[PDB]
Amino acid sequence: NELILKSLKLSTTAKEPLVYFYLIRTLFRSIGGGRFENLYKEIMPLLQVLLESLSKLIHEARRPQERDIYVELCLTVPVRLSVLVPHLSYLMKPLVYALNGSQESVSQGLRTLELCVDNLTAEYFDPIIEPVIDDVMEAL
């Protein structure tokens, strides 16, 4: 938790903030265990909202690689789906970006969508996907 919070805090003021996001991406990729999602549960909203803000307010400065990193962090959260049922609105926006990206991002987005459609009930999930259903279906 301390590492994640510090990484974000100096990412707010680093000369090249992408390095800290690379570190967080590596951490999420290489992490696995029962207690770590329990530790991420408390700090989920801050990370989600920060990734949302950076993803929406980026204009592809150097390449789309920063947006790719942001969406990969957003959809590669190690927590189980049961805890992740709330805050799904933060996940919905990067879904279209992932589905419109490269091969790995497309695969990650498709895996997230498959995990989402079957577990969640229709009446709960439908309003959440409604704002971006047209673009999601076009990309699909």
Q: Which DSSP category does 128 fall into?
A: H
The resolution, in angstroms to one decimal, equals 3.4
Gap between the Cα atoms of 60 and 132, Å rounded? 21
Technique that determined the structure = cryo-EM
Provide the token pair at 106: 């497309």
Burial class from Cβ neighbours inside 10 Å (0-12, 13-18, 19+) for residue 94 reads buried
